[PDB]
């Protein structure tokens, strides 16, 4: 069981508070605004995201996926 | 069968060429740098992304997921 957190956070400063907190909960950065990690927590994840981002302005997707779907992703670039 | 395309494209101009092309192939924008769509195409999707982005610099994830995993996402914010 995996999950992805993908975010669109307007305030520069809120964006890296969130990045910092996602690392702390053990997720790993895969791109500038996306992290992945293993199923562990959930309720804390949502609370963290809600407390940090501007909910009228920002968008965060927290998406479950199976391990085999993540494994079969295609990654283009660096 | 769904997929997500999540991107981290440095050049402003390449980013919306990609956004424009992802809409054309029928994907739908869900956030500033993420689109979702249904399984249809695949080989064309990868070719499009590779031709548009700078592959030494940019990162794009093309991620398959089951319909029920997408349905059970949590979306925070606007
Ligand atoms: Cl990766
Ligand atoms: Cl959505
Ligand atoms: Na990104
Ligand atoms: Na985004």
Swiss-Prot record, chains A, B:
EC assignment: 3.1.-.-
Alphabetic keyword roster: Antiviral defense, Endonuclease, Hydrolase, Magnesium, Metal-binding, Nuclease
Listed cofactors: Mg(2+)
Residues the record lists as binding Mg(2+): 8
Keyword Nuclease listed: yes
Molecular function terms from GO: metal ion binding; RNA endonuclease activity
Domain of life of the native organism: Archaea
One Gene Ontology biological process: defense response to virus
InterPro entries in UniProt: CRISPR_associated_Cas2, Virulence_VapD/CRISPR_Cas2
Record function comment: CRISPR (clustered regularly interspaced short palindromic repeat), is an adaptive immune system that provides protection against mobile genetic elements (viruses, transposable elements and conjugative plasmids). CRISPR clusters contain sequences complementary to antecedent mobile elements and target invading nucleic acids. CRISPR clusters are transcribed and processed into CRISPR RNA (crRNA). Functions as a ssRNA-specific endoribonuclease. Involved in the integration of spacer DNA into the CRISPR cassette.
Family indicated by similarity: Belongs to the CRISPR-associated endoribonuclease Cas2 protein family.
Subunit structure: Homodimer, forms a heterotetramer with a Cas1 homodimer.
Name by which UniProt lists this protein: CRISPR-associated endoribonuclease Cas2 2
């Amino acid at each position: 069981m995996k999950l992805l957190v993908v975010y669109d956070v307007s305030d520069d400063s809120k964006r890296n508070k969130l990045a910092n907190n996602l690392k702390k909960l053990g997720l790993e950065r895969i791109q500038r605004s996306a992290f992945e990690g293993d199923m562990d927590r959930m309720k804390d994840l949502v609370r963290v995201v809600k407390l940090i981002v501007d909910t009228n302005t920002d968008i965060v997707h927290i998406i479950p996926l199976g391990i085999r779907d993540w494994e079969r992703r295609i990654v283009i670039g660096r």
